[PDB]
């Protein structure tokens, strides 16, 4: 059948790494260790801080935002922005 000569079945849940041995997968994961930026919305994690931010702008995008000025929640942040410029419109 299709499945003939398979290899590198073990995949890394941290990156697109692979190996033909479990042990290897373990030692390989050790390298990933270090800086782990977890999401402040879900059980998500990333090595690149810059990326983590995007995860929220793509996953948790348009989340109930609470105005730090009038403690007013807004279904769509987009609006919250205009609001501040409307009600909380600065002199500058």
Known binding-site positions for Zn(2+): 12, 15, 28, 32, 39, 42, 55, 60, 67, 70, 83, 88
Between the alpha carbon of residue 54 and those of residues 18, 50, 58, 76, the distances in Å are: 26, 7, 6, 17
Single out the segment in contact with Zn ion by CB under 5 A; choices: 3-11, 18-26, 45-53, 54-62: 54-62
The label of the residue with tokens 């769509």 reads 76
Least distance (Å) between residue 85 CB and Zn ion: 10
The CA distance from 83 to 45, in Å, is 32
Q: Rule CB under 5 A: which residues touch Zn ion? A: 12, 14-15, 17, 39, 41-42, 44, 59, 67, 69-70, 72
């Amino acid at each position: 059948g299709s499945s003939g000569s398979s290899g590198k079945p073990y995949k890394c849940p941290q990156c697109s790494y692979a190996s033909a041995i479990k042990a290897n997968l373990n030692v390989h994961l050790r390298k990933h260790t270090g800086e782990k930026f977890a999401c402040d919305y879900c059980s998500f994690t990333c090595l690149s801080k810059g990326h983590l931010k995007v995860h929220i702008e793509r996953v948790h995008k348009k989340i109930k935002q609470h105005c730090r000025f009038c403690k007013k929640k807004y279904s769509d942040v987009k609006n919250l922005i205009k609001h501040i410029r409307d009600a909380h419109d600065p002199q500058d």
